[PDB]
């Protein structure tokens, strides 16, 4: 943190579409989910719950440890207030985005929000406007001192969106996905619009999803998975096949749940990994076959875990943390390795159909 920036909200409020997609307010609402998922991430957290009002306010809560009160010695603040008025960045050396940025945006960007958080045997409320406080934190119940957690209600601005309805099926989507990768969490959603309730949790995580997108026949016939890799603090989840038929082509990244649509470090990772893996193996058993050509007929669902995630490109939609690379490269070439010595006939086909793919 060798730079540390606060700003106010008035660069969101002046050019929204830069902190979030303005086509509606579900890019707000990942916003808050993201921030909820660190705490699932953190081991504090098991249970991220939407609701989506008739008033099209959104609240979502979780049952984490609850975002911290404590008033800040420098900023004469609480730790909530702090968080949701402020926009705070910082880096190694001097250089808006769609993540990285923080849960203010969602505040500059509503008309209202309300925060109920339950933490140390106290229930706190605070109320903001337009990004500022108009009711002061204050103490408005007790609970049990392990009841704790944070919820989030907000009313996103019309001014800023072309359509201030929340897309049902967009998010409904995105929570799916969210819990495919996270068996610690459940996910529930309500939608008093329409009169339906959802919950997600997903004992087997990612076993099975690609059978289910795919089938089209892959190699493995069964996808291959690397289930919860670690090397202390970094985590690493991961399904891979190839498919000769590209009809249907799933190739999907995220890190700390968070889909990354511009790819980054872990792909990488990914891509090399394999390459390695299939290059070692056509030396120990035996044209120039490249990363590209192991890559090219691959679907995939690659998930990382990682402590301080870094995003990068105009829009942050790319993992950018250098040692993610290796991380993944390295449980990818080992773990295949592994599989591919153990299962010969199958390994000769992907080997065959890659370096037909070189061919050309
Ligand atoms: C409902 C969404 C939600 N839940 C949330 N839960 C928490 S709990 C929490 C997080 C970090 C720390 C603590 C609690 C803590 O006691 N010491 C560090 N914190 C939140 N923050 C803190 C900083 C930013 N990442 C958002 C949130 C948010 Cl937002």
Same mark, same amino acid.
């Given at each position: 943190?060798?730079?540390?920036?606060?700003?106010?909200?008035?660069?969101?409020?002046?050019?929204?579409?830069?902190?979030?997609?303005?086509?509606?307010?579900?890019?707000?609402?990942?916003?808050?989910?993201?921030?909820?998922?660190?705490?699932?991430?953190?081991?504090?957290?098991?249970?991220?719950?939407?609701?989506?009002?008739?008033?099209?306010?959104?609240?979502?809560?979780?049952?984490?440890?609850?975002?911290?009160?404590?008033?800040?010695?420098?900023?004469?603040?609480?730790?909530?207030?702090?968080?949701?008025?402020?926009?705070?960045?910082?880096?190694?050396?001097?250089?808006?985005?769609?993540?990285?940025?923080?849960?203010?945006?969602?505040?500059?960007?509503?008309?209202?929000?309300?925060?109920?958080?339950?933490?140390?045997?106290?229930?706190?409320?605070?109320?903001?406007?337009?990004?500022?406080?108009?009711?002061?934190?204050?103490?408005?119940? +007790?609970?049990? !001192? /392990?009841?704790?957690? @944070?919820?989030?209600?907000?009313?996103?601005? %019309?001014? #800023?969106? $072309?359509?201030?309805?929340?897309?049902?099926?967009?998010?409904?989507?995105?929570?799916?996905?969210?819990?495919?990768?996270?068996?610690?969490?459940?996910?529930?959603?309500? +939608?008093?619009? !329409? /009169?339906?309730?959802? @919950?997600?949790?997903?004992?087997?995580?990612? %076993?099975? #999803?690609? $059978?289910?997108?795919?089938?089209?026949?892959?190699?493995?016939?069964?996808?291959?998975?690397?289930?919860?890799?670690?090397?202390?603090?970094?985590?690493?989840?991961?399904?891979?096949?190839?498919?000769?038929?590209?009809?249907?082509?799933?190739?999907?990244?995220?890190?700390?749940?968070?889909?990354?649509?511009?790819?980054?470090?872990?792909?990488?990772?990914?891509?090399?990994?394999?390459?390695?893996?299939?290059?070692?193996?056509?030396?120990?058993?035996?044209?120039?076959?490249?990363?590209?050509?192991?890559?090219?007929?691959?679907?995939?669902?690659?998930?990382?875990?990682?402590?301080?995630?870094?995003?990068?490109?105009?829009?942050?939609?790319?993992?950018?943390?250098?040692?993610?690379?290796?991380?993944?490269?390295?449980?990818?070439?080992?773990?295949?390795?592994?599989?591919?010595?153990?299962?010969?006939?199958?390994?000769?086909?992907?080997?065959?159909?890659?370096?037909?793919?070189?061919?050309?």
């Amino acid at each position: 943190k060798s730079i540390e920036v606060l700003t106010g909200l008035d660069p969101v409020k002046k050019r929204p579409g830069m902190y979030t997609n303005i086509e509606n307010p579900n890019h707000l609402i990942q916003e808050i989910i993201d921030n909820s998922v660190d705490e699932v991430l953190a081991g504090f957290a098991s249970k991220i719950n939407i609701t989506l009002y008739e008033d099209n306010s959104i609240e979502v809560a979780d049952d984490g440890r609850g975002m911290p009160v404590d008033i800040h010695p420098e900023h004469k603040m609480s730790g909530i207030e702090l968080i949701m008025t402020k926009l705070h960045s910082g880096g190694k050396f001097s250089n808006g985005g769609l993540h990285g940025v923080g849960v203010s945006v969602v505040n500059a960007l509503s008309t209202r929000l309300e925060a109920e958080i339950k933490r140390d045997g106290n229930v706190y409320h605070i109320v903001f406007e337009d990004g500022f406080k108009t009711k002061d934190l204050e103490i408005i119940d +007790n609970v049990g !001192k /392990k009841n704790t957690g @944070t919820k989030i209600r907000f009313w996103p601005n %019309k001014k #800023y969106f $072309d359509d201030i309805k929340v897309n049902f099926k967009a998010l409904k989507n995105l929570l799916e996905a969210k819990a495919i990768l996270c068996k610690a969490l459940t996910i529930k959603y309500s +939608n008093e619009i !329409k /009169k339906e309730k959802l @919950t997600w949790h997903f004992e087997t995580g990612l %076993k099975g #999803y690609l $059978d289910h997108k795919l089938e089209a026949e892959t190699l493995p016939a069964e996808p291959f998975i690397i289930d919860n890799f670690s090397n202390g603090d970094s985590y690493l989840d991961a399904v891979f096949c190839w498919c000769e038929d590209p009809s249907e082509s799933i190739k999907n990244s995220y890190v700390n749940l968070i889909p990354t649509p511009q790819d980054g470090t872990h792909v990488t990772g990914l891509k090399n990994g394999i390459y390695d893996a299939i290059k070692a193996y056509i030396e120990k058993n035996s044209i120039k076959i490249t990363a590209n050509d192991s890559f090219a007929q691959l679907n995939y669902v690659i998930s990382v875990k990682i402590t301080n995630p870094q995003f990068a490109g105009q829009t942050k939609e790319k993992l950018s943390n250098k040692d993610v690379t290796n991380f993944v490269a390295t449980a990818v070439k080992d773990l295949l390795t592994i599989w591919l010595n153990q299962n010969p006939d199958e390994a000769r086909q992907i080997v065959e159909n890659i370096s037909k793919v070189a061919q050309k």
